[PDB]
Amino acid sequence: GSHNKPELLYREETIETKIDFQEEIQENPDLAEGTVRVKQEGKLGKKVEIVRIFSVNKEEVSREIVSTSTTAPSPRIVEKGTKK
């Protein structure tokens, strides 16, 4: 019970969490033995969560999610030349 003039506030916040990716190395007979060639570049993703904070009289009441969006990570794939 905040002891002041009632006031409705809507504080919106954006949460961004980086998403880790996996790594895998595969053999490629088509390449010369020892050859290193990246098939897929390793990149981090991001989970975005936008929320709205409802406060009344400088006093937090409740929260509600405005919008979310998840960017998928990019696992890193590297080819290794061989003789098979």
UniProtKB/Swiss-Prot annotation:
Disordered: annotated span: 62-84
Subcellular location(s) per record: Secreted, Cell wall; Membrane
Domain G5: start-end pairs: 5-84
Highest taxon in the source lineage: Bacteria
Post-translational modification: The Gram-positive cell-wall anchor motif LPXTG is located in the N-terminal part, in contrast to such motifs in other known streptococcal and staphylococcal proteins. The protease could be cleaved by the sortase and anchored in the membrane via the two potential N-terminal transmembrane domains, whereas the propeptide located prior to the LPXTG motif would remain attached to the cell wall peptidoglycan by an amide bond.
Biological role stated in the UniProt entry: Zinc metalloproteinase which cleaves human immunoglobulin A1 (IgA1) in the hinge region, rendering it less efficient in coating the surface of colonizing or invading pneumococci. May be responsible for pneumococcal infection and is potentially involved in distinct stages of pneumococcal disease.
Family the UniProt entry places it in: Belongs to the peptidase M26 family.
Name used for this protein in its record: Immunoglobulin A1 protease
Organism (species): Streptococcus pneumoniae
Gene: iga
